[model samples]
Target: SVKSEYAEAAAVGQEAVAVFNTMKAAFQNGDKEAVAQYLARLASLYTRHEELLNRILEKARREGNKEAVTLMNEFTATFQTGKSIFNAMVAAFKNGDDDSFESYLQALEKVTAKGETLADQIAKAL
Candidate 1:
């Protein structure tokens, strides 16, 4: 069984995944209005997650030791970077131009790499 906090986070992730699925269906149907609605919902969910995660990280940093502080910072930064990468990738997929797609793909790769490095640093600190 997962810990409660982990379970909560996982559930949030699952909800986001469902939103993406809805978006995919909307796209497949060429229903721009539906896609926009689903995308808006997904954005709202992600924004909430971002706020909650930042607050948790701040609390961890304040209440824990040096390792905890470092780990918290790392997690916070990695999550933000990862989210940016995800956003860029989604935007690229939705963009109407090859050039925009390529640019966003490159940006996604760069931010994802930064997120990975932060994760590694956090693991070592822990």
Candidate 2:
């Protein structure tokens, strides 16, 4: 069960990353409309990811799995931090602030690394 949940979460995370890359490509290509569309889709994907994480956290809590609950909470927090960075990136992109957008992207990469570490811990615990 834990393995399956982790696999699904990882898949979602990958999908979001792919969308983010596409968004960046759109920006580089100077396709504002494509960037807007991709940004909206990226936001939707992250929202879905948050929902999935919340569901897993709730299930772990109900099952009285303390370790799973703790790991999920940590992962969720990291994910939220990434989402915040993403939001800033979106704003910067809209404002034509390339520097800010780049900085936010770097911050998001760091947050993603933290999330990966938490995910590894969850898998090891399971």
Candidate 3:
């Protein structure tokens, strides 16, 4: 069970990385629609990812695995921030606000950096 859980988490992480790479390419190409689509997909992925993390976190807590719980907590927070930023990006795209979209992209870059760190921690813990 634990091994399967770890596998699932790793799969989700890979999916998110793929989405991030695609998003970056879309942004660089100035493809606003592709960026919007990627952001929506990322938001959906993170929502499901958070649900999985929450379950793992709860299990870690029940098992008194402090390190695992801490890593999962940080991972969850990082993804939540990313999810919120993606939602904002969607809104900015819908409004055709290039300025806001650029700003959100900057914010997303920061969040993605933090998320990368947290994801590493969670992976190590798992």
Candidate 4:
């Protein structure tokens, strides 16, 4: 059961990427409603992603896997900030505020980069 965590995490990571790409593509194509729909899905994915990471963190610590524990700890924090920015992006988009939306969207890119990179590192570390 504990071993199942990584697969779930990686699978969810892939799902997140797919949703993110689609939503960004929609945004580029001026599809506001579709982007909003994907943002909700993105939020849901992060909630599940963090839960899975949290669970695997417990398993890692139990096995004294320090590297894995630290790896996940980093990811959780990154995801939290990413979620925060996402909320801001959601608000700005709904408000039709271009500057705020652009600012948060750009900020989100860096965090997502690290979040995605670290998602795979845990499996390697463990």
Candidate 5:
């Protein structure tokens, strides 16, 4: 039997999954209001998760958890690279230049490849 705290956590997880499903449906059906509402909620959840992770990392550091430190560093580095590629793609789209857009896509692909290469390296290390 699950404890009350664990059950509450599971419920929140299920609610998040439900919100994501609704968000996807709104996007598919072109319901802007529904999409925005669900997306905003999803973003809030992500922000909260990020905050929680930061707190966990801080606590781990205080306890001298070397493994957590290394994992967090690698995760943040991977995310930063991905974020950069996405930002570049968004900027290219906004500019509406076909040639530049293609070039930006190629760059994005190259960066994504770099991420895959890093993943391979991590796998080999493990």
Candidate 6:
């Protein structure tokens, strides 16, 4: 239950950082091909983590834990924002818009950092 969810949350945070750092390195080296692949990989990661968080939310709801529910909601919302920025970056990549691409890359970094921090809190809660 909650312990399983905690494991998933920790995994999600770790994986996001791993992929994100790799992607940034690829971008830095002009490995457009690898960056593109990482973009898709991150999208899938975001989707799966959000799914697991939803499950966690359901458990919190069942237990009438408003604090936990609130934390999950905030984390989910931040993750969704990351998804939005990721899409923007992808669109920028396709459109040959370097400026937007870089800006969104920065945005996603912040968003993911926020996600990771929230996941840390969730782990402690569990």
- Which of the numbered candidates is closest to the native, going by highest TM-score? 6
Model 5: per-residue lDDT, tens digit, 24-117? 5664566757755775675565455345445544655676766655665575566456456545644544564446645654664565455554
Model 6 scores a TM of 0.89
Candidate 6 residue-wise lDDT at 6? 64
Candidate 3 at residue 84, lDDT? Answer: 83
How does candidate 5 fare on TM-score?
0.50
The alpha-carbon lDDT assigned to residue 99 of candidate 2 equals 88
Cα lDDT of candidate 5 equals 0.52
lDDT of 6 at 74: 85
Instruction: State candidate 4's TM-score.
Output: 0.86
> What are the per-residue Cα lDDT tens digits for candidate 4 across 1-126?
555678878789779889988987898788898998998998889789878878888889899988888987887778789889988999998899968977887788878876666777877787
Expressed as tens digits, the lDDT of each residue in 1-126 for candidate 1 is 112433454466558768866776666676777866886787787787677556655655565657756766666776676577667656755775446645654664465455655444543443
How far is 82's C-alpha from truth in model 4 (Å)?
1.1
- Top candidate on lDDT is 4
Determine the C-alpha RMSD for candidate 6 after optimal superposition of all C-alphas.
1.5
Instruction: Decide which is better by lDDT, 5 or 6.
Output: 6
lDDT value for candidate 1?
Answer: 0.61
Q: For each candidate in the order shown, give its overall lDDT on alpha carbons.
A: 0.61, 0.82, 0.78, 0.83, 0.52, 0.82
For residues 6-121, write the lDDT of model 6, one tens digit per residue.
69766985797799899988988889999999989988887887788788888988888788888878887887788899889989988988889889999888777656767777
Candidate 5, RMSD to the unseen true structure:
8.1
Report the error of model 4 at residue 104, Å.
1.7
Using lDDT as the measure, what is the rank order of every candidate, best first? 4, 2, 6, 3, 1, 5
RMSD of each: 5.2, 1.8, 2.2, 1.8, 8.1, 1.5
> How much lDDT does candidate 4 score?
0.83
Model 2 worst lDDT window (10 residues)? 117-126
Q: Per-residue lDDT for 87 in model 5? A: 54
**CA displacement after TM-score superposition, residue 50 of candidate 3 (Å):** 1.2
